[PDB]
Amino acid sequence: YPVLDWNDIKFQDVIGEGNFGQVLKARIKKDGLRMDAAIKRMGELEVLCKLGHHPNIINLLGACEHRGYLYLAIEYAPHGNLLDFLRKSRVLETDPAFAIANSTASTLSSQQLLHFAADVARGMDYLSQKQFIHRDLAARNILVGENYVAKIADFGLSRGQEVYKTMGRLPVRWMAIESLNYSVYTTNSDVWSYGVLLWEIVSLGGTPYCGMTCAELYEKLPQGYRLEKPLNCDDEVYDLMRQCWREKPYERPSFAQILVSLNRMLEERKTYVNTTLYEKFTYAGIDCSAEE
């Protein structure tokens, strides 16, 4: 582990709280440089030390025991979590004069949205090769870092130790059928969750299955029910999502193959996510009561 001097840290605001600890924005000095960090004040240390160097996995900058407490200095992601970032892009909601004037539903382009999807895939490929299973992949656990690079994170909810207050049943909407029905978690179930995350990206942060209860998922998913294609989505992108949600876990693509499909889409001249406004346009719904 890299060890940080207590005196090398200037703390600022609290940016997250929980029964188990808090997260503070801070400035640290490391090696020679002064830098931003998010410091978790209270395992997690070992995991971040192994994987964090990957540019699509949130990194450990350093650790520090001071008095009773352990402090983990985590790479600061200035743009916050991807779900909120996606929703803030809904410029017809958040800046209608700009949205209408520019005939646009988002400040994010099709390519930027695909780059986020590719970033998460790249990170998941590496993580799955290192034999980790995420178990709670969703846009709320992705950070948008320096230079808009997406970083995979985990805020502790799955371990009963959340920082920042999620409705307990909310993760059901990202769970593979085999996780729902048999409590099985594998790389293949992480791929299913990934598909739901891709759907989040394309829908600019819609609540998956908005208007449906979790109970309805248990009944309908094994009947072949799946998230509908967003109106703004090319068939190719939706086909990729649908691959992620094949009933048979062993028929889902690997993260490496996901990344190859996305890069092939990124490389073409064609536009895959339509961000244009038109009459009767509507965003995928958000159900705040399913979430909070």
Ligand X SMILES: CNC(=O)c1cc(Oc2ccc(NC(=O)Nc3cc(C(C)(C)C)nn3-c3ccc4ncccc4c3)c(F)c2)ccn1
Query: Which residues of the chain form contacts with ligand X (CB under 6 A)?
Result: 15, 23, 38, 40, 43-44, 47-48, 51, 57-58, 72, 74, 76-77, 80, 132, 134, 143, 152-156, 159, 161
Please compute, for residue 288, the number of CA atoms within 13 A of its CA located in the half-sphere on the CB side: 2
- Whether residue 211 contacts residue 287, with contact meaning beta carbons closer than 8 Å, is answered with yes
Q: Pick the closer one to ligand X by CB: 153 or 244.
A: 153
Any known ligand binding at 178?
A: no
Taking the C-alpha atoms of residue 226 and residue 246, their distance in angstroms, rounded to an integer, is 10
Any known ligand binding at 21?
A: yes
Any known ligand binding at 123?
A: no
Q: Pick the closer one to ligand X by CB: 68 or 211.
A: 68
Any known ligand binding at 149?
A: no
Cα 58 to Cα 1, 44, 106, 267, distances in angstroms: 15, 12, 26, 26
Q: Which residues are catalytic?
A: 136
Dihedral class, residue 131 (left if φ above 0, else alpha if ψ from -120 to 50, else beta) = left
CB of 79 to ligand X, least distance (A): 7
Q: What are the residues whose beta carbons fall under 8 Å from the beta carbon of 138, sequence distance 6 or more? A: 83, 171, 174, 193, 196, 197, 200
- Whether residue 20 contacts residue 70, with contact meaning beta carbons closer than 8 Å, is answered with no
Q: Pick the closer one to ligand X by CB: 156 or 253.
A: 156
**Which residues are known binding-site members?**
15-23, 40
